[PDB]
Each structure stands twice: as C-alpha cells, then as structure tokens.
C-alpha cells in the first residue's frame, strides 16, 4: 500500500493540495508536509542560512515555517515522514508550469526533490483554477498506474492538466518543454518619497510552442506529461568549448 509524500507550492491550505489529499487517502497512506504560505517563485530554493520550524495540525499535516517546497520534501524524506515515503507528489498547483517556467517552479522543484525514491515523482499543475476535480483524477490514474507497474526510466514526471471537466480532456501526451523569447520588461513604480522600485513582470512571448511541446498539448486539450531530469550539462557544446580553450590558450602554455 503506497506511502505518499504530498507537498506543494501554494501552501498547506491551498485548495489544490487538500483536494489531492482527499483523493489520495482513498487508496494510499498520505502524509502532507507543505510550506505555510503561498510562496510560488521559489525554485529549487533551499533554506541554508537558518534552521526550520515545524508545525503539525488537527489531522497530521505538517507545515514548514517559512519553508520552501524543496525544504518540505527534504525534511519530509529524511526526518519528518517515517517510515519513509515510496513517492513524492507535488500537490495540484493553481496555474501552469510549462516551458521555461519549469526551471523557476517551486512545485516542479518539490517533485525534483523526490527523484531518488522507489517511484517517479509527480509534479501536477492545473492550467487555471476551477476543475481541481480533473487534475485529481489524472493523478490517481497515473498513481494506480505506477502501482501495477513500475516505470523503468525517468525520475521526474511533470504533469499539466487543462482547466476543463474530465469528460472534455481529449487524452494525454508525452511532451518536451517549450521556450519563450527572453523576458525583458521591468515595471518601475515609485514610493511616496520619490525612489523607484522595480517589478519583474511578464515573461516573453512563446518561442518554440510547436507540435512536440508541453504548450501545444495543453493548448490542444491534453494532459501533458514531461519527463524531467537534473543534468544541466549541454553535452553537445563540449568539443567546441575545448577547441575554443586551446584556440585562445587558457589552461595551457601552448
């Protein structure tokens, strides 16, 4: 019987995470360890300068004080949940995590943090705010599915679900991350004393959102499943960087 570490990114009381927990407690033992306040825009952010305070609740749900999504699952796996989870699922998130985004996503990061357990970790995001209903069903399918048969390759599955009633989601689709044009907008806004403060503001237009992409999938009406890894090496850049090095003679006398 599956042991589930359920975290998320929107906080221990987000409709997203609570819904998923009810659905999952139907066939698995779930233990929630989530951050205490919506703070999305954390990435694989990790509290290193300070220790972490824990708070447990009425049920058994833990919230990490000021804790980051990676904070949560990390504490969850090596201290807080015992016996250890078999999987971590990163609880239904209010809003997409597609393309370039994924690198900055706290919800993707919680999943990435469970890349080492018996089962692949699931990140789950709704594109919108209404049909949490649907994302739960999708996750359960994915989960019963792992339980009859283990997946031999891919330790992070990044799922996004369209904001449509289950009956209208056309299927699911294995995808690749898309990309936007480089973001560059900064919105200045000035404080009552004259000084300029800056907002980061909105991401670039969609660049590669062709047929193979997670963007196209969701746009079409499919669950989009992207397998993620954690090796950022640009392997094909290799010889070029080496020729360069030799060409200009850094690291060499000759």
Distance (Å, rounded) from C-alpha 54 to C-alpha 35?
10
Q: Are 113 and 35 in contact (CB under 8 A)?
A: no
Distance (Å, rounded) from C-alpha 35 to C-alpha 38?
7
Between 51 and 80, how does the x/- string for binding to its own copies read (CB under 8 A)?
Answer: xxxx-------------x-xx--xx-xxx-
* C-beta of 61 vs 101, nearer to its own copies: 101
**Helix, strand or coil, per DSSP, at residue 26:** coil
Of residues 111, 98, 54, the one with CA closest to residue 80: 54
93 binds, among Mg ion, its own copies, none (CB under 5 to 8 A by kind): Mg ion
Among 4, 10, 17, 176, binds Mg ion (CB under 5 A): 10
Of residues 70, 106, 86, the one with CA closest to residue 31: 86
| Shortest Cβ 210–Mg ion spacing (Å) | 26
DSSP string, 99-115: TTGGGG-HHHHHHHTTT
* C-beta of 119 vs 132, nearer to Mg ion: 132
Provide the residue count of the chain: 254
**According to the binding rule CB under 8 A, does residue 229 interact with its own copies?**
yes
Between 12 and 41, how does the x/- string for binding to Mg ion read (CB under 5 A)?
Answer: ----------------------------x-
Which of these segments, 20-28, 85-93, 128-136, 237-245, binds its own copies (CB under 8 A)? 237-245
Among 1, 26, 49, 211, binds its own copies (CB under 8 A): 49
Q: Any idea what the Cα angle at residue 92 is, between residues 168 and 33, rounded to 5°?
A: 160
Q: Is 40 annotated as a binding residue?
A: yes
Contacts to its own copies from residues 5-34, by CB under 8 A: none
Binding residues: 9-10, 40, 93
Residues in contact with Mg ion by the rule CB under 5 A: 9-10, 40, 93
């Amino acid at each position: 019987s599956m042991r589930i570490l359920l975290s998320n990114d929107d906080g221990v009381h987000a409709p997203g995470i609570q819904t998923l927990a009810k659905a999952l407690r139907e066939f698995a033992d779930v233990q929630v360890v989530a951050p205490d306040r919506n703070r999305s825009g954390a990435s694989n952010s990790l509290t290193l300068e300070s220790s972490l305070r824990t708070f447990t609740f009425d049920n058994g749900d833990i919230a990490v004080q000021m804790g980051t999504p990676t904070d949560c699952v990390y504490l969850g796996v090596n201290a807080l949940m015992r016996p250890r989870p078999d999987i971590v699922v990163s609880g239904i998130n209010a809003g997409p995590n597609l393309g370039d985004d994924v690198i900055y996503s706290g919800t993707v990061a919680a999943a990435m943090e469970g890349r080492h357990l018996g089962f692949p970790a699931l990140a789950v995001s709704l594109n919108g705010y209404q049909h949490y209903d649907t994302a739960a069903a999708v996750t359960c399918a994915l989960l019963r599915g792992l339980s009859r048969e283990p997946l031999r390759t891919g330790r992070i599955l990044n799922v996004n679900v369209p904001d449509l009633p289950l009956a209208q989601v056309k299927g699911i689709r294995v995808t690749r991350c898309g990309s936007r044009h480089p973001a560059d907008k900064v919105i200045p806004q000035e404080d009552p004393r004259g000084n300029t403060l800056y907002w980061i503001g909105p991401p670039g237009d969609k660049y590669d959102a062709g047929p193979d992409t997670d963007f196209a999938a969701v746009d079409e009406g499919y669950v989009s499943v992207t397998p993620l890894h954690v090796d950022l090496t640009a392997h094909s850049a290799h010889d070029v960087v080496s020729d360069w090095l030799d060409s200009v003679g850094v690291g060499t006398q000759w």
